mmCIF file of C-alpha atoms and ligand atoms in Angstrom:
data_model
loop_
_atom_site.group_PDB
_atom_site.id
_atom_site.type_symbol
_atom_site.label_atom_id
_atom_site.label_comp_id
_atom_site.label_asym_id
_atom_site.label_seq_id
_atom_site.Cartn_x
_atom_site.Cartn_y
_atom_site.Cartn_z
ATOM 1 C CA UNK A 1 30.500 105.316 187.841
ATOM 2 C CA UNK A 2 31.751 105.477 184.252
ATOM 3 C CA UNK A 3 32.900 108.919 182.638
ATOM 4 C CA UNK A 4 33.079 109.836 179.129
ATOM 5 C CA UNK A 5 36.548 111.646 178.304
ATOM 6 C CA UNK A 6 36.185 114.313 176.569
ATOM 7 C CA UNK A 7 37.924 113.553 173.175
ATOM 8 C CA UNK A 8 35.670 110.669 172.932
ATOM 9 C CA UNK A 9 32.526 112.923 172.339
ATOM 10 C CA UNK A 10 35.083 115.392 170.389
ATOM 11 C CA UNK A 11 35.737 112.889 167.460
ATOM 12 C CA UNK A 12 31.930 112.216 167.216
ATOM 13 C CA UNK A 13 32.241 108.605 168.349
ATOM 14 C CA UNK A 14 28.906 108.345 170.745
ATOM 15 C CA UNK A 15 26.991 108.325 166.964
ATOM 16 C CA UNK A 16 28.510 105.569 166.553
ATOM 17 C CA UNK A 17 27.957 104.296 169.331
ATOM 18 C CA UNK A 18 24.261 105.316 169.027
ATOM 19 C CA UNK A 19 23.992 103.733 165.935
ATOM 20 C CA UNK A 20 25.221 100.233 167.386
ATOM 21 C CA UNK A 21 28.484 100.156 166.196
ATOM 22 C CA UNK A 22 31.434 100.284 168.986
ATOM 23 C CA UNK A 23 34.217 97.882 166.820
ATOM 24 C CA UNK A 24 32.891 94.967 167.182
ATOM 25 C CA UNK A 25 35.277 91.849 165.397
ATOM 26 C CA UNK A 26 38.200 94.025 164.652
ATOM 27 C CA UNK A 27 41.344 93.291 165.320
ATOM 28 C CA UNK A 28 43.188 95.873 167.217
ATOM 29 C CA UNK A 29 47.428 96.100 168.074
ATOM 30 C CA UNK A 30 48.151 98.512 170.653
ATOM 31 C CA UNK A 31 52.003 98.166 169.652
ATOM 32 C CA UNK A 32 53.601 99.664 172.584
ATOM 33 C CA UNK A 33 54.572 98.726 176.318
ATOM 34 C CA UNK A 34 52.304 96.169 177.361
ATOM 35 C CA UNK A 35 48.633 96.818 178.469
ATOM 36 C CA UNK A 36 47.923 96.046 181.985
ATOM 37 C CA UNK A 37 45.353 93.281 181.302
ATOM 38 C CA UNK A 38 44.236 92.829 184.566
ATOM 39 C CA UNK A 39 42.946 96.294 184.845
ATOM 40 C CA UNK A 40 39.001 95.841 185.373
ATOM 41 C CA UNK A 41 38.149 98.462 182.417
ATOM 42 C CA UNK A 42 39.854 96.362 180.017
ATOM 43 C CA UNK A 43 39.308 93.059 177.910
ATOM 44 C CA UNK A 44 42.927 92.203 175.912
ATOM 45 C CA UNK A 45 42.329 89.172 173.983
ATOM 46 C CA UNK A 46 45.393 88.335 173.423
ATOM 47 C CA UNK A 47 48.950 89.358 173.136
ATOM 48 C CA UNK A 48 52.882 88.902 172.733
ATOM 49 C CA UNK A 49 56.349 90.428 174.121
ATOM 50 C CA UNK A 50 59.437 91.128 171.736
ATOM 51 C CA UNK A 51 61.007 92.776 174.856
ATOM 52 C CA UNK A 52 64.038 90.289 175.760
ATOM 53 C CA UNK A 53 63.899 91.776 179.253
ATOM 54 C CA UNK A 54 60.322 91.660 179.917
ATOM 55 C CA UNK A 55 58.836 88.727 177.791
ATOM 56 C CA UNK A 56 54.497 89.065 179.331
ATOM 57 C CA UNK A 57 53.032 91.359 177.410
ATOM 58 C CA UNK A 58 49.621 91.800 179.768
ATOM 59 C CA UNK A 59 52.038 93.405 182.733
ATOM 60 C CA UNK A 60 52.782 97.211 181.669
ATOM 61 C CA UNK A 61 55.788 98.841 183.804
ATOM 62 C CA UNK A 62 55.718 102.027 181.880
ATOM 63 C CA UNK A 63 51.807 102.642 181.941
ATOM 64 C CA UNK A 64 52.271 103.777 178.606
ATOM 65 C CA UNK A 65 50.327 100.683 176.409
ATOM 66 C CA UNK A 66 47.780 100.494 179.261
ATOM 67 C CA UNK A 67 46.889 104.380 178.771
ATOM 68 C CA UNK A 68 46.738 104.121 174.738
ATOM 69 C CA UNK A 69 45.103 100.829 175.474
ATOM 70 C CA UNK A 70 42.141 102.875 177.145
ATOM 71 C CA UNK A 71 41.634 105.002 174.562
ATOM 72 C CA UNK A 72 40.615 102.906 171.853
ATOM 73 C CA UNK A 73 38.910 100.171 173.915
ATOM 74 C CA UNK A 74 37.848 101.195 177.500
ATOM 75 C CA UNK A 75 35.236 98.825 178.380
ATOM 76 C CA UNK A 76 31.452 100.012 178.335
ATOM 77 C CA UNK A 77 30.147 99.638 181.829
ATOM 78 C CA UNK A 78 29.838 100.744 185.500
ATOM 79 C CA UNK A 79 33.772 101.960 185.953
ATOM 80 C CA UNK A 80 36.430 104.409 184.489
ATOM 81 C CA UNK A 81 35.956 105.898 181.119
ATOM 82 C CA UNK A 82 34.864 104.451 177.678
ATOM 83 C CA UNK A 83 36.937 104.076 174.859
ATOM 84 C CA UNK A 84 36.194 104.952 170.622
ATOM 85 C CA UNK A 85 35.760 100.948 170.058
ATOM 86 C CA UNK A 86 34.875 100.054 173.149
ATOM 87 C CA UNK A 87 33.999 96.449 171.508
ATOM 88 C CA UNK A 88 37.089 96.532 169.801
ATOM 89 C CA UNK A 89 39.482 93.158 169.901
ATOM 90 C CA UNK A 90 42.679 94.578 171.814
ATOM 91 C CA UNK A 91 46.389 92.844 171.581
ATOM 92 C CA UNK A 92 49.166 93.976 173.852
ATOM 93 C CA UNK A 93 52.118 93.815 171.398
ATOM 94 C CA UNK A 94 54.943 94.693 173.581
ATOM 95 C CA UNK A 95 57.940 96.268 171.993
ATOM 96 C CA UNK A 96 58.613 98.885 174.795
ATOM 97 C CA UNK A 97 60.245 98.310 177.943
ATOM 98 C CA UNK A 98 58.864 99.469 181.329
ATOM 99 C CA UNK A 99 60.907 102.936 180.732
ATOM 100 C CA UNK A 100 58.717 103.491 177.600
ATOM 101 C CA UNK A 101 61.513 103.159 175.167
ATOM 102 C CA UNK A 102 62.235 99.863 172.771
ATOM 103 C CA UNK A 103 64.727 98.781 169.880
ATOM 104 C CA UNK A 104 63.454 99.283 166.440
ATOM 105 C CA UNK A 105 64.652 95.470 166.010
ATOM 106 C CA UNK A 106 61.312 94.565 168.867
ATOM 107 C CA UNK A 107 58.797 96.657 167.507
ATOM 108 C CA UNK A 108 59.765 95.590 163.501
ATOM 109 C CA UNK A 109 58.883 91.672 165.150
ATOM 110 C CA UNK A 110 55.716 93.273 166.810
ATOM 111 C CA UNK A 111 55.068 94.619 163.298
ATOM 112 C CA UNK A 112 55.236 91.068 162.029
ATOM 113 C CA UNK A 113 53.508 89.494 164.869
ATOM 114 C CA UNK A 114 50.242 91.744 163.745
ATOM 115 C CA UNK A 115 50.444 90.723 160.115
ATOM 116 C CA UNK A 116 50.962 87.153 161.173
ATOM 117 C CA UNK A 117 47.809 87.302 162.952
ATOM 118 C CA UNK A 118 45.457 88.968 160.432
ATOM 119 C CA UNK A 119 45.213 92.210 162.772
ATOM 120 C CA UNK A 120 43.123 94.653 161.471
ATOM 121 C CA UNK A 121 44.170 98.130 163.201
ATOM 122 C CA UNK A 122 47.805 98.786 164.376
ATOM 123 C CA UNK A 123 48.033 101.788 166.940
ATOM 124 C CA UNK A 124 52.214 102.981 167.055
ATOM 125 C CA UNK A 125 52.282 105.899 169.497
ATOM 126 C CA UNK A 126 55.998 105.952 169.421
ATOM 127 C CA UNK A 127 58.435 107.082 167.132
ATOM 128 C CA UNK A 128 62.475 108.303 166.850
ATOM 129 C CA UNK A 129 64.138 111.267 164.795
ATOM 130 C CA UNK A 130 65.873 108.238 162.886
ATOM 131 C CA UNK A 131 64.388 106.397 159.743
ATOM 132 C CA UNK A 132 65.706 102.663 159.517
ATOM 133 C CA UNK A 133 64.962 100.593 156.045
ATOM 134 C CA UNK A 134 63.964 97.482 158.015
ATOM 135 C CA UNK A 135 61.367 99.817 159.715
ATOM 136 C CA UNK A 136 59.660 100.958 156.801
ATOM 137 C CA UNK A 137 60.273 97.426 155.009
ATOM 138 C CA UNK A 138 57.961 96.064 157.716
ATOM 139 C CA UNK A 139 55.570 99.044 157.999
ATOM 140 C CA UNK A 140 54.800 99.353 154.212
ATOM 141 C CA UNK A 141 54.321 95.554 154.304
ATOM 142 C CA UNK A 142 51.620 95.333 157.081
ATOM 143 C CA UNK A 143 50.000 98.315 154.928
ATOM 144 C CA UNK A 144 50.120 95.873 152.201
ATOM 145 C CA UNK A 145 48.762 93.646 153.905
ATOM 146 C CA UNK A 146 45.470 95.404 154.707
ATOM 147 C CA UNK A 147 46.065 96.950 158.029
ATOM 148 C CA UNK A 148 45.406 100.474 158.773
ATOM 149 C CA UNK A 149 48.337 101.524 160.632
ATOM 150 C CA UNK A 150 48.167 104.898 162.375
ATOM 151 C CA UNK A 151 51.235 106.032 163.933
ATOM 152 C CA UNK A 152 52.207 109.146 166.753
ATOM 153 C CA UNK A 153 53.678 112.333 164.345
ATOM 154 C CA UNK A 154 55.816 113.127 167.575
ATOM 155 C CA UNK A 155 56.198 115.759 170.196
ATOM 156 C CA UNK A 156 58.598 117.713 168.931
ATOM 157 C CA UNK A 157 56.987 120.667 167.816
ATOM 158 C CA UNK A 158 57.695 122.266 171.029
ATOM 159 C CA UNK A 159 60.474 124.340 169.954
ATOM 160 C CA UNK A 160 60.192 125.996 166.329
ATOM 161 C CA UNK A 161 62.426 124.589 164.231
ATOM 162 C CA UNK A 162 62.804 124.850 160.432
ATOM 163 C CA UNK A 163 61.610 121.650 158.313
ATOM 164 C CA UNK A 164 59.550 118.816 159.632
ATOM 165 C CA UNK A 165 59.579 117.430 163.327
ATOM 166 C CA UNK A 166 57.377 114.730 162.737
ATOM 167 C CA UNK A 167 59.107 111.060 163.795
ATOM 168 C CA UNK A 168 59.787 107.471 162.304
ATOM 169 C CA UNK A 169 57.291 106.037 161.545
ATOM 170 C CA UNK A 170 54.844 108.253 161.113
ATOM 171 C CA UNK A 171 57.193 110.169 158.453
ATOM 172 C CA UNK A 172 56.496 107.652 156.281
ATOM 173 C CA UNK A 173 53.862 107.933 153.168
ATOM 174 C CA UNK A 174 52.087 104.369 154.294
ATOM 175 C CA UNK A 175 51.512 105.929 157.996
ATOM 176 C CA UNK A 176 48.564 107.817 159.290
ATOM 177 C CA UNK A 177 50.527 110.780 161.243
ATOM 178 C CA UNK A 178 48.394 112.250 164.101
ATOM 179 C CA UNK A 179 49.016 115.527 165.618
ATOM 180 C CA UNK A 180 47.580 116.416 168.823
ATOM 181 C CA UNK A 181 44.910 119.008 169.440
ATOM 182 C CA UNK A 182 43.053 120.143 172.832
ATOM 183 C CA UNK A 183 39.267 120.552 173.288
ATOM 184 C CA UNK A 184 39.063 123.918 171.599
ATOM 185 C CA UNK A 185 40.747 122.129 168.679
ATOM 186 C CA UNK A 186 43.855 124.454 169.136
ATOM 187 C CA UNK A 187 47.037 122.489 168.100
ATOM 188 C CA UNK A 188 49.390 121.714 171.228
ATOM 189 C CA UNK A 189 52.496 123.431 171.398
ATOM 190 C CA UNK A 190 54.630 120.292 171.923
ATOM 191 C CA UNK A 191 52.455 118.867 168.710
ATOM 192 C CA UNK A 192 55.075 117.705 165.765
ATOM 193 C CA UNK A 193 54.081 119.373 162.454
ATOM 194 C CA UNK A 194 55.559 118.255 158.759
ATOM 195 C CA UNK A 195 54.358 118.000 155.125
ATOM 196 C CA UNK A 196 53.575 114.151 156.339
ATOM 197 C CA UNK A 197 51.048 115.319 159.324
ATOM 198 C CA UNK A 198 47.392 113.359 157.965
ATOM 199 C CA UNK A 199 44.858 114.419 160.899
ATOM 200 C CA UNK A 200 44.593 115.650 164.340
ATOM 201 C CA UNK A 201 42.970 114.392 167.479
ATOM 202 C CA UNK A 202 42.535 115.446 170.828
ATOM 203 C CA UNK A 203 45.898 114.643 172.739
ATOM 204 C CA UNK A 204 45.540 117.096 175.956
ATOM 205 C CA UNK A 205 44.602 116.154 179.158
ATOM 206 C CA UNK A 206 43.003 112.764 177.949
ATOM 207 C CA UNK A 207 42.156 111.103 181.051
ATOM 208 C CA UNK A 208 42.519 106.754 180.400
ATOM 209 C CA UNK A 209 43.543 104.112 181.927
ATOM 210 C CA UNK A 210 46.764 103.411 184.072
ATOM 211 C CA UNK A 211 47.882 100.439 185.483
ATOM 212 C CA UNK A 212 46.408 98.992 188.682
ATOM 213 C CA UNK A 213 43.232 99.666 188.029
ATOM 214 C CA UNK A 214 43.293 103.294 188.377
ATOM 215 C CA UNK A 215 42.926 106.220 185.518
ATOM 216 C CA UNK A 216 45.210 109.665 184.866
ATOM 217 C CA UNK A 217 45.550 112.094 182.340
ATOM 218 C CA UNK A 218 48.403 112.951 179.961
ATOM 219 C CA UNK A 219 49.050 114.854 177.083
ATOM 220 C CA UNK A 220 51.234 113.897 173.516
ATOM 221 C CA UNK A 221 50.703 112.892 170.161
ATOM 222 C CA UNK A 222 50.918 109.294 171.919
ATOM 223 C CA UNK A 223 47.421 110.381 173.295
ATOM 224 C CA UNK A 224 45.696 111.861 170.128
ATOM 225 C CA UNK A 225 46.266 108.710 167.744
ATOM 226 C CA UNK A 226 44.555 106.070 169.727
ATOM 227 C CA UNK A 227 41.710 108.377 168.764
ATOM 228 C CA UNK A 228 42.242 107.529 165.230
ATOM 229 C CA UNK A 229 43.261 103.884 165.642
ATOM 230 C CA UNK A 230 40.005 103.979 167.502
ATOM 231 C CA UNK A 231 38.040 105.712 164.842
ATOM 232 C CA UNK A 232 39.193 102.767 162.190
ATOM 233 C CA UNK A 233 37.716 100.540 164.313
ATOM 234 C CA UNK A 234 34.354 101.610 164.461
ATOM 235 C CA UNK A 235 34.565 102.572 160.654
ATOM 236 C CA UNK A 236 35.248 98.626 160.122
ATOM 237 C CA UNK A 237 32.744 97.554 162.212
ATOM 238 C CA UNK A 238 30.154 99.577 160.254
ATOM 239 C CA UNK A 239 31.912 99.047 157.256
ATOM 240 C CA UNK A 240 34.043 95.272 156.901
ATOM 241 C CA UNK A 241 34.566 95.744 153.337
ATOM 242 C CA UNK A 242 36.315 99.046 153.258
ATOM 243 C CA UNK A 243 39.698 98.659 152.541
ATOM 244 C CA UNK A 244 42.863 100.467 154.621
ATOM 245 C CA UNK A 245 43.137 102.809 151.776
ATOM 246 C CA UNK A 246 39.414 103.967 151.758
ATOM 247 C CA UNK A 247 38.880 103.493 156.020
ATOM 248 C CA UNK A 248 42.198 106.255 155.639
ATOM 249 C CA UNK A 249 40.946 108.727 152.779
ATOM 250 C CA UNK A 250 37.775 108.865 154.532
ATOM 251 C CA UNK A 251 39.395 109.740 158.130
ATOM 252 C CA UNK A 252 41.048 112.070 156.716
ATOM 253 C CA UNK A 253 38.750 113.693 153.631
ATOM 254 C CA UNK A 254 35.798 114.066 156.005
ATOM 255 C CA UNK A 255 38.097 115.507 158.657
ATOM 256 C CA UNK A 256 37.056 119.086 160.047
ATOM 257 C CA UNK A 257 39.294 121.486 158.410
ATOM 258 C CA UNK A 258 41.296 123.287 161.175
ATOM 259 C CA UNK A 259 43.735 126.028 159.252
ATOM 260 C CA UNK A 260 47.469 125.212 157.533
ATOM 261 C CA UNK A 261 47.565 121.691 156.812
ATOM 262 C CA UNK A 262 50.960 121.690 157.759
ATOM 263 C CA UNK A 263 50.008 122.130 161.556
ATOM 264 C CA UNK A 264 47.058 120.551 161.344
ATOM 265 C CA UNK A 265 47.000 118.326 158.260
ATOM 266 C CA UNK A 266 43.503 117.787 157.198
ATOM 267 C CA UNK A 267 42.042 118.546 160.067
ATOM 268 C CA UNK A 268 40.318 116.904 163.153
ATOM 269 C CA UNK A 269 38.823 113.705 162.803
ATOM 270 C CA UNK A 270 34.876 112.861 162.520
ATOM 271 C CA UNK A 271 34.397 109.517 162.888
ATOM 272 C CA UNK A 272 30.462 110.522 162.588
ATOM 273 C CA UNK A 273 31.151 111.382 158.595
ATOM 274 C CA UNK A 274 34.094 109.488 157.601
ATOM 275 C CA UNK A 275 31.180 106.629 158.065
ATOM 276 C CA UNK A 276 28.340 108.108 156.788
ATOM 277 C CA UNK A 277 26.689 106.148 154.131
HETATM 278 CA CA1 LIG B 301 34.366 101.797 181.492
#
């Protein structure tokens, strides 16, 4: 039988769902380590590999894609768990190798592949301590470009440090940062916090699914923004003329206000009212 994980009801995405909108006709790129394609809970419509090493994209050796991959799009039906958009058009984009980790020089050509391709939605949950030109050069182009690109603020909050923890590229102004919270909407401890956090979303114990056709929990900022990547979807699929810009200042103005913004940035997503009408 099919569960419901819990930070799919905590984002408010069954009213969506209620209402008859699940993401229908948008475009999603889970840019990451693959997505196991062949796992029964998911439909991946397409896909490419920037890994030299590992050039099919639908064969995930970290688990990593395949997990994300789950979140926004976990199929509506008898098995596993449901995603935000679970009608959503997914892409494996691989640009991580099967030890989770990738070259900024793969994931800037999975950058391009997506705005080659008239992608919609671009979920990044990875990120480095390191800025590189080329990186943002691509990122603020897709931006340009239309797509909503939301992007993991990093777990590096973990130890409290002075001055911003939050990674490349969700650093960057064009980026939707997402910190993590858990069900209680406390912020995790690992969580990354900066001036350039944007929203939280659950990113604790978020049970998806793996490769092989099985499902498993983790926790990290890599968890909470397919919530958000997610949440665009659905917002789009209600909403096809909203532009990035608006489908991001309403995630994040109609987010519920959790304390210091920056912990917490705006506050916890609500897909319910950022689509209200
Ligand atoms: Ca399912």
């Amino acid at each position: 039988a099919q569960s419901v994980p819990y930070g799919i009801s905590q984002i408010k995405a069954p009213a969506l769902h209620s209402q008859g909108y699940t993401g229908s006709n948008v475009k999603v790129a889970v840019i990451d380590s693959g997505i196991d394609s062949s796992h029964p809970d998911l439909n991946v419509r397409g896909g490419a590999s920037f890994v030299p090493s590992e050039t099919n994209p639908y064969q995930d050796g970290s688990s990593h894609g395949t997990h994300v991959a789950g979140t926004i799009a976990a199929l509506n039906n008898s098995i596993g768990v449901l995603g935000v958009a679970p009608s959503a058009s997914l892409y494996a984009v691989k640009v991580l190798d099967s030890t989770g980790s990738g070259q900024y020089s793969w994931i800037i050509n999975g950058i391009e592949w997506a705005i080659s391709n008239n992608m919609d939605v671009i979920n990044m949950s990875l990120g480095g301590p390191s800025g590189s030109t080329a990186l943002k050069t691509v990122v603020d182009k897709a931006v340009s470009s239309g797509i909503v690109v939301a992007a993991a603020a990093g777990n590096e909050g973990q130890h409290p440090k002075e001055g911003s923890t939050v990674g490349y590229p969700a650093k960057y102004p064009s980026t939707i940062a997402v910190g993590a919270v858990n069900s209680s909407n406390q912020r995790a401890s690992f969580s990354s916090a900066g001036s350039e956090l944007d929203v939280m979303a659950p990113g604790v114990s978020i049970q998806s699914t793996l490769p092989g056709g099985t499902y498993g929990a983790y926790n990290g900022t890599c968890m909470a923004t397919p919530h958000v990547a997610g949440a665009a979807a659905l917002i789009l699929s209600k909403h096809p003329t909203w532009t990035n810009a608006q489908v991001r200042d309403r995630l994040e103005s109609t987010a519920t206000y959790l304390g210091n913004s920056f912990y917490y940035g705006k506050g916890l997503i609500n897909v319910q009212a950022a689509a209200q009408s």
